[PDB]
Amino acid sequence: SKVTTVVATPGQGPDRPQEVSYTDTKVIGNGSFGVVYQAKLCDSGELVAIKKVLQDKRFKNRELQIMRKLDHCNIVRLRYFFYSSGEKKDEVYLNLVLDYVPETVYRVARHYSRAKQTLPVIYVKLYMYQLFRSLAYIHSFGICHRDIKPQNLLLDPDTAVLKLCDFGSAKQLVRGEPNVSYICSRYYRAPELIFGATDYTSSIDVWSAGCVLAELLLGQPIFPGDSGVDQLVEIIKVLGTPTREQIREMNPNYTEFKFPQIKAHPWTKVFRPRTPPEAIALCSRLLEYTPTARLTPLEACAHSFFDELRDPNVKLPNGRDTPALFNFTTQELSSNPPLATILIPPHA
Amino acid sequence: XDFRFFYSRYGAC
Ligand SMILES: [Cl-]
| Strand order across the A161-164 sheet | A103-104, A153-156, A161-164
CA–CA dist A261, A215 (Å, integer): 25
CA–CA dist A340, A141 (Å, integer): 19
CA–CA dist A348, A324 (Å, integer): 10
Q: Enumerate long-range contacts of A217-222, CB under 8 Å, 24 or more apart.
A: A217/A124, A217/A271, A217/A272, A217/A275, A217/A279, A217/A280, A217/A283, A218/A270, A218/A271, A218/A272, A219/A109, A219/A112, A219/A113, A219/A116, A219/A118, A219/A119, A220/A113, A221/A187, A222/A270, A222/A287
CA–CA dist A26, A35 (Å, integer): 10
**Is A6 within the bounds of a domain?**
no
Same domain for A214 and A186, yes or no, is: yes
Q: In this structure, what are the phi and psi dihedrals at residue A42, rounded to the nearest 5 degrees?
A: -70, -35
CA–CA dist A110, A117 (Å, integer): 10
* Interface contact A115, partner B, CB < 8 A: no
Catalytic residue numbers of A read 147
Same domain for A188 and A334, yes or no, is: yes
> What is the domain count for chain A?
2
- Answer yes or no: are the C-beta atoms of A22 and A4 closer than 8 Å: yes
Distances (CA, A) of A313 to A76, A319, A322, A323: 28, 11, 10, 13
Handedness of CA A322, A301, A121, A305 (dihedral sign): positive
Same domain for A26 and A111, yes or no, is: no
**Is A154 within the bounds of a domain?**
yes
Same domain for A170 and A75, yes or no, is: no
Give the pairing type, strands A47-54 and A143-144: unpaired
Same domain for A60 and A199, yes or no, is: no
SS3 A164: strand
A90-104: string of b/e by CB count within 10 Å (b at 16+)?
eeebbbbbbbbbbbb
Contacts of A170 (CB under 8 A, 6+ apart): A62, A63, A66, A138, A143, A144, A145, A146, A147
* Interface contact A157, partner B, CB < 8 A: yes
Contacts of A58 (CB under 8 A, 6+ apart): none
Q: Enter the DSSP assignment of A258.
A: -
Give the pairing type, strands A18-31 and A47-54: unpaired
Same domain for A90 and A233, yes or no, is: no
Comparing C-alpha atoms, which of A101, A66, A78, A73 is closest to residue A12? Answer: A78
Determination approach: X-ray
Exposed/middle/buried for A330, CB within 10 Å: 0-12, 13-18, 19+?
Answer: exposed
CA–CA dist A169, A55 (Å, integer): 15
SS3 B5: coil
> Among residues A99, A121, A139, which one ends one of the domains?
A99
> Among residues A49, A83, A99, which one ends one of the domains?
A99
A197-215: string of b/e by CB count within 10 Å (b at 16+)?
beebbbbbbbbbbbbbbbb
CA–CA dist A175, A187 (Å, integer): 26
**Is A8 within the bounds of a domain?**
no
CA–CA dist A282, A269 (Å, integer): 15
- Answer yes or no: are the C-beta atoms of A175 and A263 closer than 8 Å: no
Q: Which residues of A touch B5 (CB under 8 A)?
A: 28-29, 102, 104, 107
- Answer yes or no: are the C-beta atoms of A292 and A203 closer than 8 Å: yes
How many other CB atoms are found less than 10 A from the CB of residue A312? 8
Same domain for A115 and A191, yes or no, is: yes
Q: How many CB pairs under 8 A join A and B?
A: 38
Residue of A76, A107, A185 to mutate, interface with B, max B Cβ within 10 Å? A107
CA–CA dist A30, A14 (Å, integer): 30
Same domain for A32 and A114, yes or no, is: no
Same domain for A160 and A277, yes or no, is: yes
How many other CB atoms are found less than 10 A from the CB of residue A230? 13
Structural domain harbouring A85 = 15-99
**Is A5 within the bounds of a domain?**
no
SS3 A21: strand
The distance in angstroms from the start CA to the end CA of chain B is 7
Same domain for A205 and A67, yes or no, is: no
**Is A348 within the bounds of a domain?**
no
Q: Is B11 left (phi over 0), alpha (psi -120 to 50) or beta?
A: left
List, in sequence order, every beta strand (DSSP E) within chain A: 3-10, 18-31, 34-41, 47-54, 78-84, 93-99, 103-104, 143-144, 153-156, 161-164, 171-172
CATH number, domain at A235?
Answer: 1.10.510.10
Comparing C-alpha atoms, which of A222, A225, A189 is closest to residue A208? Answer: A189
CA–CA dist A145, A143 (Å, integer): 6
The 3-class SS string of A88-124 reads CCCCCEEEEEEECCCEEHHHHHHHHHHCCCCCCHHHH
Q: In this structure, what are the phi and psi dihedrals at residue A65, rounded to the nearest 5 degrees?
A: -55, -40
> Among residues A53, A70, A99, which one ends one of the domains?
A99
- Answer yes or no: are the C-beta atoms of A239 and A289 closer than 8 Å: yes
**Is A74 within the bounds of a domain?**
yes
Choose among A108, A111, A151: nearest Cβ to B2: A151
Comparing C-alpha atoms, which of A28, A26, A29 is closest to residue A40? Answer: A26
Same domain for A81 and A65, yes or no, is: yes
Distances (CA, A) of A86 to A22, A62, A338: 18, 20, 49
What is the CA(A67)–ligand 1 centre distance, in A? 21
**Is A334 within the bounds of a domain?**
yes
Choose among A27, A108, A152: nearest Cβ to B10: A108
Same domain for A276 and A178, yes or no, is: yes
Q: Which residues pair with A40 in a beta bridge?
A: A23, A47
What is the CA(A243)–ligand 1 centre distance, in A? 36
The distance in angstroms from the start CA to the end CA of chain A is 46
How many other CB atoms are found less than 10 A from the CB of residue A255? 14
Q: What is the resolution of this structure in A?
A: 1.8
Comparing C-alpha atoms, which of B9, B1, B11, B13 is closest to residue A101? Answer: B9
**Is A125 within the bounds of a domain?**
yes
Q: Which residues of A touch B8 (CB under 8 A)?
A: 102-103, 107
CATH number, domain at A44?
Answer: 3.30.200.20
Contacts of A237 (CB under 8 A, 6+ apart): A262, A265
SS3 A76: coil
Q: Which residues pair with A209 in a beta bridge?
A: none
CA–CA dist A203, A199 (Å, integer): 11
CA–CA dist A49, A78 (Å, integer): 10
